[PDB]
Design a protein around this motif. Structure first.
Motif, PDB file in Angstrom:
ATOM      1  N   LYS A 124      27.816  22.116 126.567  1.00  0.00           N
ATOM      2  CA  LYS A 124      28.951  21.209 126.696  1.00  0.00           C
ATOM      3  C   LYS A 124      28.646  19.861 126.051  1.00  0.00           C
ATOM      4  N   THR A 125      29.688  19.066 125.829  1.00  0.00           N
ATOM      5  CA  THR A 125      29.531  17.752 125.219  1.00  0.00           C
ATOM      6  C   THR A 125      30.801  16.921 125.368  1.00  0.00           C
ATOM      7  N   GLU A 126      30.632  15.608 125.488  1.00  0.00           N
ATOM      8  CA  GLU A 126      31.766  14.704 125.637  1.00  0.00           C
ATOM      9  C   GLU A 126      32.056  13.972 124.329  1.00  0.00           C
ATOM     10  N   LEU A 127      30.999  13.496 123.679  1.00  0.00           N
ATOM     11  CA  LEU A 127      31.138  12.776 122.418  1.00  0.00           C
ATOM     12  C   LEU A 127      30.923  13.711 121.232  1.00  0.00           C
ATOM     13  N   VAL A 128      31.636  13.448 120.141  1.00  0.00           N
ATOM     14  CA  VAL A 128      31.520  14.263 118.937  1.00  0.00           C
ATOM     15  C   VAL A 128      32.305  13.650 117.782  1.00  0.00           C
TER      16      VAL A 128
END
Length: 176
Positions: free
Chosen positions: A57-61
């Motif tokens: 998972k990830t929030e920033l991109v």
């Protein structure tokens, strides 16, 4: 011949950085500092470093619209001269337009060449860990990065960025 002494500073803020990149470049420290580790050697006849599974998972991109030139074999993991070779290699093979469109993802300090036609299509998956060297060639729209696939093998992938390779590269800087 000797002609100048005019005195004028007409340069862009985006080139100020790209300059140092074209001069020396960017060599991953971990690639060389990867001496302190704990490897294991147990029965496991296979042609792969185990399994990866689903993506985390990830929030920033960050997504950058760039083109794909292709992979190019090199002799050294680092060395501007070496990189510039790949760029000129592909550039000659394929034209500026011949290069297809692709979306570059810079999430979790990870590089994933996503397909422009399909978002859920990871064309290439590279990690800052494997990344050995990365810099800008003669042109500011030419960015390539060499990775380690194992067996002393290095694949130099070139990508065209616009209006320049200042953003992409920069974003990859902290990725290390």
């Amino acid at each position: 011949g000797s002609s100048g002494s005019s005195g004028d500073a007409a340069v862009t803020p985006e080139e100020r950085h790209l300059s140092k990149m074209q001069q020396n470049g960017y060599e991953n420290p971990t690639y060389k500092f990867f001496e302190q580790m704990q490897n294991s050697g147990s029965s496991g006849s296979s042609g792969s470093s185990g399994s990866s599974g689903p993506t985390p998972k990830t929030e920033l991109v960050q997504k950058f619209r760039v083109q794909y030139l292709g992979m190019l074999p090199v002799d050294r993991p680092v060395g501007m001269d070496t990189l510039n070779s790949a760029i000129e290699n592909l550039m000659t093979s394929s034209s500026k337009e011949d290069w297809p469109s692709v979306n570059m993802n810079v999430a979790d300090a990870t590089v994933t060449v996503i397909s422009e036609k399909n978002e859920e299509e990871v064309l290439v998956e590279c990690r800052v860990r494997f990344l050995s060297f990365m810099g800008v060639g003669k042109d500011v729209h030419t960015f390539a990065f060499i990775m380690d696939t194992g067996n002393q093998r290095f694949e130099c992938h070139v990508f065209w960025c616009e209006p320049n390779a200042a953003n992409v590269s920069e974003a990859v800087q902290a990725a290390c």
